[PDB]
Amino acid sequence: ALSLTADQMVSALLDAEPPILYSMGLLTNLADRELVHMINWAKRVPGFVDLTLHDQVHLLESAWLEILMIGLVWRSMEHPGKLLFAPNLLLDRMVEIFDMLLATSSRFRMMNLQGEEFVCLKSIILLNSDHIHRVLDKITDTLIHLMAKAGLTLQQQHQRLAQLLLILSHIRHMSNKGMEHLY
Amino acid sequence: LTADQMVSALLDAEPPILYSSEASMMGLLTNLADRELVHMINWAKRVPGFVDLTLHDQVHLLESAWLEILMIGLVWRSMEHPGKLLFAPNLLLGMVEIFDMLLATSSRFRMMNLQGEEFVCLKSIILLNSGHIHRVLDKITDTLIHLMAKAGLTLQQQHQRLAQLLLILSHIRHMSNKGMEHL
Ligand SMILES: C[C@@]1(c2ccc(/C=C/C(=O)O)cc2)c2ccc(O)cc2CCN1c1ccc(F)cc1
Ligand SMILES: C[C@@]1(c2ccc(/C=C/C(=O)O)cc2)c2ccc(O)cc2CCN1c1ccc(F)cc1
Numbered sequence: 001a002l003s004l005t006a007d008q009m010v011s012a013l014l015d016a017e018p019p020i021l022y023s024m025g026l027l028t029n030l031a032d033r034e035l036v037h038m039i040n041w042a043k044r045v046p047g048f049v050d051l052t053l054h055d056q057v058h059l060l061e062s063a064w065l066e067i068l069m070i071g072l073v074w075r076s077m078e079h080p081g082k083l084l085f086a087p088n089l090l091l092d093r094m095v096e097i098f099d100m101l102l103a104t105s106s107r108f109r110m111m112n113l114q115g116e117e118f119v120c121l122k123s124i125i126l127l128n129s130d131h132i133h134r135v136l137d138k139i140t141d142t143l144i145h146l147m148a149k150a151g152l153t154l155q156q157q158h159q160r161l162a163q164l165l166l167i168l169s170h171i172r173h174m175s176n177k178g179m180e181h182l183y
Numbered sequence: 184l185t186a187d188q189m190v191s192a193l194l195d196a197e198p199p200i201l202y203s204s205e206a207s208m209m210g211l212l213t214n215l216a217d218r219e220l221v222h223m224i225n226w227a228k229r230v231p232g233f234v235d236l237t238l239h240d241q242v243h244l245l246e247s248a249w250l251e252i253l254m255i256g257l258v259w260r261s262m263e264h265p266g267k268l269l270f271a272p273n274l275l276l277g278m279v280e281i282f283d284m285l286l287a288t289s290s291r292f293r294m295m296n297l298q299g300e301e302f303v304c305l306k307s308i309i310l311l312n313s314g315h316i317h318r319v320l321d322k323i324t325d326t327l328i329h330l331m332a333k334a335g336l337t338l339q340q341q342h343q344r345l346a347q348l349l350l351i352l353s354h355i356r357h358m359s360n361k362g363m364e365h366l
């Protein structure tokens with residue numbers, strides 16, 4: 001967990017990955033079926049099981065929607081102007097949240113976000129929304145290595161890591177707007 | 184502008200510290216916040232790269248960031264005052280939820296031993312992030328790293344500190360959202 005290397009952290013994350021399911025009622029039914037596979041992914045995040053049930057519940061209640069959003073943004077990346085809710089539910093341009101989702105998707109695309117970098121971002125969201133901080137520092141370590149072992153200079157590595165984490169503020173912002181609509 | 188010239192430009196741009204029943208409390212807080220907004224606008228004009236932006240882009244960034252800016256400044260003032268919020272030197276104190284979240288942020292920056300130099304960098308990041316811009320944000324990332332390097336942190340600690348700071352901004356954005364909601 002705190003002893004895992006960069007490669008091992010990515011391997012545990014890429015293999016923890018939930019499947020892509022198929023389909024407001026249609027989106028609610030999709031989101032409910034996605035919840036169950038998210039719980040399974042979360043129990044496979046290194047360090048997450050080393051927390052008590054109530055801390056795990058607290059982290060999932062806060063992160064749930066941002067986790068749905070980031071996966072949606074990722075799977076929609078190679079479909080500009082469209083949100084791929086499911087392979088059978090690709091929606092063209094609550095529309096307030098949708099344009100933000102599209103902008104996050106454009107941003108991730110022009111940055112050329114990698115699958116290994118994505119799964120790292122998903123994990124941080126779950127943990128950020130002493131042990132928790134040590135694991136986050138390990139995910140920070142995991143992130144820099146992928147950029148280092150991609151041909152980026154130490155300056156470009158800190159710049160990409162900044163840009164990536166600043167997108168999480170925008171992801172937090174969309175989840176708040178989403179939670180406002182639901183309640 | 185160099186990494187050293189950036190910190191100096193920012194530190195000089197710092198706004199002054201202003202002075203200060205639910206309606207009574209809200210009256211005093213709204214009054215202070217409205218006076219602080221005038222100095223925040225003038226501070227924004229001194230942030231390297233901000234005046235290069237169109238007046239339309241300046242308005243949008245400030246409209247988006249204002250409450251995050253009031254909040255980070257509050258958090259930074261309340262740092263060496265545990266369990267209290269330094270709204271003003273004469274004002275050290277259904278809004279307790281946002282208040283307890285602000286106190287947690289204060290404790291976090293205290294734990295982390297946040298430095299004034301880093302604060303002004305975090306404050307500038309918010310203004311540009313919340314709402315060319317990317318190259319300026321990239322310049323503030325270098326600046327934060329250049330300061331972490333000068334304090335004698337290893338390259339590992341340097342990138343771990345960068346991440347630790349930028350993830351607090353997600354929580355700052357979350358606090359502004361709940362606050363904008365209450366207002
Ligand atoms: C459409 C939806 C969503 C998520 C949860 C629920 C549950 C409702 C309930 O419990 O009644 C419904 C829809 C979604 C669904 C599945 C998915 O993979 C990704 C996203 C992206 C974010 N999103 C969303 C939520 C609220 C908004 F205001 C705007 C967008
Ligand atoms: C108290 C207040 C605040 C900021 C803006 C206004 C504007 C009112 C209006 O426009 O009517 C009122 C209070 C504050 C005051 C001064 C300051 O330096 C920093 C902060 C940051 C946190 N904050 C806050 C806002 C909303 C909440 F729900 C909880 C807390």
